RNA sequence: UGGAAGUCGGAAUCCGCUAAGGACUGUGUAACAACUCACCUGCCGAAUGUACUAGCCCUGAAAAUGGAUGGCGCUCAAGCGU
């Protein structure tokens, strides 16, 4: 029921974020030194990481919080690396480029405001804006007929993809949390989803031992990827879009290309 | 959602934790947040109760 | 007399907080324990606030 | 069992509802004016149910 | 007089002895020597 | 002329500790709000911590003092960030406190300890820290106490 | 297994006369005389020492060896009864209806009689005839207390048990209705 | 024997000690023997002995053993062939009954003065002679049983009424209050717990302890001490008259 | 129960020929079936059975162990 | 009466004077009563009694063994599948049941 | 936690003094108190405890006219084993 902050150089704990009554299922670190935690005690918490203190406590979910996603996750995972593949010369320019990419991804109405989405076992999702709305959710995303396992913002910040246990992936508008279309090709619970870098395609890895690439603008099944002998547990799409990696119960790493 | 709400509520709070010798429930689940909302809710609850009694008497 | 363990500020504030429930009802504030402290012994802006 | 031991309250009769902070004398007043056996004690939340 | 309490309250009951019908067949020293011999054998 | 000694548990920097105290000190002739004021003034150095407070009553006035306890001393030495106890519940004391502060807490608690030596007092404080759930020198307080018993760690005498 | 010889002993006080004939035991003391027929139990009685009675069983089983302990306790209780006597103190308590206890002695039979009235407002009069040799009195040192005394412990305790059992609440919650007469003390008269 | 008493298996943490505790006591006494100049033998006969904790805390430079008497005698060595030090077997003659060892480096005169000045009021155990008559007055039973005035006393707890009835006091429950007879002190005499000069039994001592009445005292009597430098044993006044074995 | 004052219908110990013959036939068939099951039994069985040993209460068990030791020493010396 | 009135009556008046002694004596007689039930009950009641005592003895043995041993998932799954109710999960093309009892047309 | 002091709960369950005593086995309190158990010492005094195995005995399910070791009856057998 804790989150520990480590200094990587020394290996020691700086802060212990505690207060959850259940296991912390997900942790994210945003671009304004705020740490987001989703737990099995049905709560989503925001912490000031510099002070190690609690800022927000959302208690709207009716069951386990499984996954949380930030609107700036794609650029925060890659920092200053982008399509150019020439890194800046010095640390100051590298940090400036990383901060510029983060602010470009996280700007809402001209100001930096990271948006948060939480997917839960109560069959729902909640869309939050702590900066502007505070403790009031932006929206409640409804339509899944079973537990929502995974959720992810698109890299352009216009769409939200969600993988649920009702063998379905759903698409939502990232601004107001409105349903758009249902992706219906899987026959077993979908465990993972991953966006492409241009936000046209989402790949879903499911319990039915398959991956599926969906075109989100036509809302159709672009590609079917069979080959896994058993359940798919982890799916990633590379930041430059060249490869999709999958792994699961058949113990072999699978990479997929165009 | 309504098909699974009952089992969701029981998974969240078991019967032994709600009422009984080993119950740990302390805060009730309310449909109101403020005192003004409570006053309004009591007014409409009394009105609906009287309407139901009148329709039962008429039936 | 505040031998209940709570302040007169808190008692008046609780009364003001639950006052919207008292609509269409008849409200009597009973000052108990006059054998300990009378109303006239109060420091008089408390008497004013009670008024 | 709790419902069998619940008190019988008529919502549509003449009723005097005694309320306030803990340890102010509510149970003492109800004992003094009625025959109900509601305990009177110096500690807070002696009365945990409606009498 | 009696200084202790009896649990069932029948205070007239005498201080009973253990029911050992085979008491007195073997002395203590012989049993000690047999204990040592049995331990060595084991 | 009779001295009355009352022990209670209070949270530092709060006036609500006299709510359970007023029904008995009221007939004793004490002012509950004044007593709560002295309690808050005495416990101002223990903000957010549960401490044991001793009241000595002589001629209808109360002297208020704080009795040191090992749990309060360990949680104070942990140097946790300040928080609102009404909003930040179910917290854990998982930080680290050094062995020098452990020995200092043992020296402070020597007036309560029945142990023959400061090593025994230090092992008592380490057991209390183990119950609290903190770390000593980044490791388990049980492990440090085991090292002290084995002789790898030397504790000063008095 | 059969045990060749098993033995028990009973000390006898200096003011007590014990006569045993064909397993009929007569014990005489300052307080009177008690008799008990023990012919249902196989036992050899003897005088192993002055002031000591010996009891033995030859070639007996474990049960036959064990029965001598019961015989020993019975004879010891008779000795205690003729020396110090036995006394049971009972208390009668009530909620609303005061229990009325009247103690008389029947001249025709020599036995005491106890009459109980107003037990939880009942109109019936309960009558208990006491065992012979059992004296019943109403206490003056305490409130609502009867004292039963005698030489026979069995008679005194059975008489107290009869008094306790005649005042039984029926078809009521016994958590709520607490009236009755209960044995409150057991001991010796002296 | 099919017919037997059912043995209760205790589902508690602490188990029976066994021979390991005896060996640990042997090793502890034998290792504390060479570190001290004097070994006193003291007796506390028919006493509660819970103040030995305070005695241990006060004599922090000394070592106190309060163990099984035969085990401590065997640790010291009852014979010159098995004694752990020169002349130490002469000290084992005092080890009868409830006794203890006291290893010290202090002055024997200092030890004797300390144990002569040590005095405490204690509850009596069964077998002691009652020094005075104790009587609970009729009416409301208070927590001290009438030793302190009832104006300064508090009423006794209502949970003790069945225990008082079991210990022989004819008390009753009147509206939440334990009363001896009537609520106004009528229709019953007071209850005499004990009379002066009467040998107390455990029911009476339990009643006195429940009413917090101390009729005895805690006193440690030194019988004699062995000195390591001289190798000899000095007898004291209590050891002159106490039986030896 | 009220068995002494009001006994019930007695349970007859007088056997019938039909039941005796049926029980004999069933016992013989059970014996043959058990022999067949023992023939087709797949449960593991040891080649040498476990020996109980020498009882502890036998007063010359130590001397018997001594005799066994000297016999095995003599056998090892001869072989 | 209202709320916990039997508990309040216990607090104000106690119990019957012999309640503790009678309860202790009944709990003492429990062993003789259980043996009498084992040797004297008849029929289906005795069979259910024997089954239920077999269950209590097995449970008591398990508890004693656990207290004696007080001083001493299977398949790898991702983190989102932890703490969930997961199944235990344990050429000749022969079926599991290759032979059954034949059914005659008359049956 | 309104209150929760071993004993409504969640999780930890260590050290000292030790002869020994659980961060407690039950009773109990609103919470304390108080009692009790585990464990230790004194008195006592010589053999016991646990679990299995093999005999005999009881239970291990019974309907419906009144009855059956063949019947009387039999108890250190007139039952059971050699
Ligand atoms: Mg109150």
């Amino acid at each position: 029921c804790t989150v520990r902050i480590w200094l990587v150089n020394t290996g020691r704990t700086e802060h212990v974020l505690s207060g959850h009554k259940g296991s912390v299922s997900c942790v994210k670190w945003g671009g304004t030194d705020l740490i987001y935690t989703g737990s099995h005690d049905r709560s989503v918490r925001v912490w000031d990481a510099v002070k190690g203190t609690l800022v927000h406590n959302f208690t709207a979910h009716g069951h386990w919080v499984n996954h949380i996603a930030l609107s700036s996750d794609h650029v925060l995972r890659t920092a200053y690396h982008d399509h150019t593949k020439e890194v800046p010369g010095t640390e100051e320019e590298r940090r400036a480029k990383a901060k510029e990419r983060f602010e470009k991804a996280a700007k809402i109405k001209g100001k930096v405001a990271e948006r948060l989405v939480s997917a839960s076992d109560d069959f729902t999702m909640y869309l939050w804006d702590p900066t502007n709305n505070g403790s009031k959710p932006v929206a409640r995303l409804l339509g899944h007929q079973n537990k929502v396992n995974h959720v992810q913002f698109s890299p352009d910040g216009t769409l939200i993809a969600s993988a649920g246990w009702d063998n379905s992936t759903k698409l939502w508008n990232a601004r107001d949390g409105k349903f758009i279309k249902n992706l219906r090709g899987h026959v077993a619970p979908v465990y993972q989803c991953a966006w492409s870098a241009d936000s046209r395609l989402v790949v879903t890895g499911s319990k039915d031992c398959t991956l599926k690439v969906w075109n989100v603008r036509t809302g159709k099944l672009a590609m079917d990827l069979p080959g896994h002998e058993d359940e798919v547990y982890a799916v990633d799409w590379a930041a430059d879009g060249e490869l999709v990696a999958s792994g699961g119960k058949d113990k072999a790493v699978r990479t997929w290309r165009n | 959602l309504k098909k699974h709400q009952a089992k969701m509520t029981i998974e969240r709070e078991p019967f032994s934790e709600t009422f009984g010798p080993k119950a740990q429930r302390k805060r009730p689940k309310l449909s109101f947040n403020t005192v003004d909302e409570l006053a309004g809710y009591s007014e409409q609850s009394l009105d609906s109760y009287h309407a139901r009694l009148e329709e039962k008497k008429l039936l | 007399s505040e031998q209940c363990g709570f302040s007169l500020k808190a008692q008046i504030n609780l009364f003001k907080s639950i006052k919207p429930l008292f609509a269409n009802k008849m409200v009597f504030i009973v000052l108990n324990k006059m054998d300990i402290k009378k109303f006239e012994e109060l420091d008089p802006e408390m008497q004013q606030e009670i008024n | 069992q709790h419902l069998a031991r619940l008190p019988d309250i008529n919502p549509t009769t003449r009723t005097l509802l005694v309320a306030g902070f803990p340890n102010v004398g509510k149970s003492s007043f109800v004992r003094s004016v009625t025959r109900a056996d509601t305990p009177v004690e110096p500690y807070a939340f002696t009365t945990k149910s409606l009498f | 007089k009696n200084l202790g309490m009896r649990k069932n309250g029948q205070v007239w009951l005498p201080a009973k002895k253990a029911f050992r019908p085979t008491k007195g067949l073997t002395s203590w020293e012989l049993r000690v020597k047999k204990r040592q011999e049995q331990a060595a054998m084991k | 002329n009779e001295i009355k000694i009352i022990h209670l548990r209070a949270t530092g920097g709060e006036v609500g500790a006299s709510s359970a105290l007023a029904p008995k000190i009221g007939p004793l002739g004490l002012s509950p709000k004044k007593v709560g004021e002295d309690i808050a003034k005495a416990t101002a150095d223990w903000k957010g911590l549960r401490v044991t407070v001793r009241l000595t009553i002589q001629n209808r006035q109360a002297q208020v003092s704080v009795v040191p306890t090992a749990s309060a001393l360990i949680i104070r030495a942990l140097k946790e960030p300040p928080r609102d106890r009404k909003k930040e519940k179910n917290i854990k004391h998982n930080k680290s406190v050094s062995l020098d502060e452990i020995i200092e807490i043992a020296r402070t608690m020597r007036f309560k300890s029945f142990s023959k030596d400061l090593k025994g007092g230090v092992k008592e404080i380490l057991g209390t820290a183990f119950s609290v759930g903190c770390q000593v020198d980044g490791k388990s307080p049980k492990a440090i106490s085991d090292a002290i018993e084995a002789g790898e760690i030397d504790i000063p005498d008095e | 297994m059969r045990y060749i010889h098993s033995e028990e002993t009973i000390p006898v006080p200096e003011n007590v006369k014990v006569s045993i004939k064909s397993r009929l035991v007569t014990v005489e003391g300052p307080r009177g005389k008690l008799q008990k027929d023990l012919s249902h139990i196989a036992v050899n009685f003897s005088v192993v020492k002055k002031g000591v009675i010996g009891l033995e069983i030859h070639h007996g089983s474990r049960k036959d060896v064990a029965a001598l302990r019961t015989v020993r306790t019975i004879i010891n209780n008779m000795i205690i009864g003729v020396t110090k006597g036995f006394k049971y103190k009972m208390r009668y308590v009530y909620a609303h209806f005061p229990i009325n206890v009247n103690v008389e002695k029947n001249a025709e039979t020599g036995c005491y009689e106890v009459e109980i009235r107003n037990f939880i407002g009942e109109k019936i009069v309960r009558k208990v005839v006491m065992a012979p040799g059992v004296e019943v009195e109403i206490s003056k040192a305490q409130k609502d207390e009867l004292i039963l005394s005698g030489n026979s412990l069995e008679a005194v305790s059975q008489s107290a048990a009869d008094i306790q059992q005649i005042c039984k609440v029926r078809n009521k919650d016994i958590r709520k209705f607490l009236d009755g007469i209960y044995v409150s003390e057991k001991g010796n008269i002296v | 024997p099919k017919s037997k008493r059912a043995r209760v298996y205790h589902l508690t943490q602490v188990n029976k000690k066994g021979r390991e505790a005896k060996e640990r006591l042997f090793s502890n006494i034998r290792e504390t023997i060479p570190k001290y100049q004097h070994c006193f033998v003291f007796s506390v006969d028919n006493m509660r002995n819970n103040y030995l904790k305070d005695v241990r805390h006060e004599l922090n430079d000394c070592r106190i053993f309060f163990g099984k008497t035969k085990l401590m005698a065997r640790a010291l060595g009852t014979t010159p062939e098995e004694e752990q030090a020169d002349g130490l077997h002469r000290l084992t003659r005092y080890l009868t009954g409830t006794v203890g060892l006291l290893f010290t480096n202090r002055d024997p005169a200092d030890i004797e003065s300390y144990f002569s000045n040590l005095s405490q009021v204690d509850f009596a155990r069964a077998g002691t002679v009652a020094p005075r008559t104790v009587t609970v007055p009729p009416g409301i039973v208070y927590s001290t049983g009438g030793e302190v005035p009832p104006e300064h006393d508090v009423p006794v707890s209502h949970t003790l009424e069945p225990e008082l009835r079991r210990l022989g006091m004819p008390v009753r429950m009147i509206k939440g209050k334990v009363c001896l007879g009537d609520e106004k002190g009528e229709a019953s005499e007071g209850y005499t717990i004990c009379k002066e000069g009467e040998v107390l039994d455990s029911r009476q001592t339990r009643l006195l302890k429940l009413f917090s009445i101390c009729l005895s005292e805690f006193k440690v009597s030194l019988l004699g001490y062995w000195s390591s430098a001289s190798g000899e044993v000095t007898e004291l006044e209590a050891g002159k008259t106490r039986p030896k074995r | 129960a009220g068995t002494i004052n009001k006994p019930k219908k007695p349970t007859s110990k007088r056997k019938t020929t039909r039941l005796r013959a049926k029980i004999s036939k069933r016992a013989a068939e059970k014996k043959r079936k058990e022999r067949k099951l023992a023939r087709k039994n797949p449960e593991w069985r040891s080649k040498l059975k476990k020996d109980p040993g020498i009882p502890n209460l036998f007063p010359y068990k130590e001397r018997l162990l001594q005799q066994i030791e000297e016999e095995r020493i003599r056998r090892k010396e001869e072989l | 009466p209202q709320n916990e009135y039997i508990e309040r009556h216990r607090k104000l008046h106690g119990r019957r004077l012999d309640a503790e002694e009678r309860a202790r004596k009944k709990a003492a007689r429990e062993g003789h009563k259980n043996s009498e039930n084992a040797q004297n009950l008849r029929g289906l009641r005795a069979k259910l009694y024997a089954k239920q005592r077999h269950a209590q003895k097995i449970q008591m043995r398990k508890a004693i063994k656990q207290h004696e041993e007080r001083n001493v998932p299977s398949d790898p799954i991702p983190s989102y599948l932890l703490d969930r109710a997961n199944p235990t999960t344990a050429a000749r093309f022969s079926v599991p049941i290759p032979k059954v009892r034949g059914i005659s047309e008359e049956e």
Side-chain angles (χ1 to χ4, degrees), chain H residues 44 47 49 51-52 55 118-120 122 216-220:
Chain H
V44 278
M47 275 159 208
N49 302 336
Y51 304 113
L52 277 179
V55 176
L118 179 62
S119 181
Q120 264 267 3
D122 203 0
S216 188
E217 63 149 359
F218 175 75
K219 211 70 146 83
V220 181

Side-chain angles (χ1 to χ4, degrees), chain A residues 48-150:
Chain A
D48 183 21
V50 189
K51 290 219 290 304
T53 58
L54 185 66
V55 178
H56 284 117
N57 191 0
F58 313 139
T59 53
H61 284 294
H63 214 333
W64 287 1
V65 178
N66 302 325
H67 199 254
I68 55 177
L70 294 176
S71 59
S72 57
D73 268 345
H74 300 272
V75 298
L76 284 186
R77 286 202 21 218
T78 52
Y80 53 88
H81 303 282
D82 62 345
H83 63 98
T84 73
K85 298 219 41 162
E86 301 50 82
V87 316
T90 77
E91 181 190 319
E92 211 304 281
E93 287 95 56
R94 278 177 290 187
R95 287 164 57 91
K97 207 191 142 173
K99 186 174 182 177
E100 162 257 307
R101 292 179 78 241
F102 156 69
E103 288 163 327
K104 204 271 200 63
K107 261 172 187 175
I108 295 266
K109 266 145 206 313
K111 309 63 73 183
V112 169
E114 268 182 329
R115 310 268 267 205
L116 173 68
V117 62
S118 52
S120 44
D121 275 2
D122 60 9
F123 300 6
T124 82
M125 285 167 274
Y126 270 106
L127 176 63
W128 315 89
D129 199 339
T131 298
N132 303 340
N133 302 27
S135 150
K136 214 261 306 183
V138 181
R140 187 176 205 187
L141 282 56
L142 289 166
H144 273 293
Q145 307 291 88
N146 207 336
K147 308 177 289 292
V148 197
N149 201 69
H150 199 250

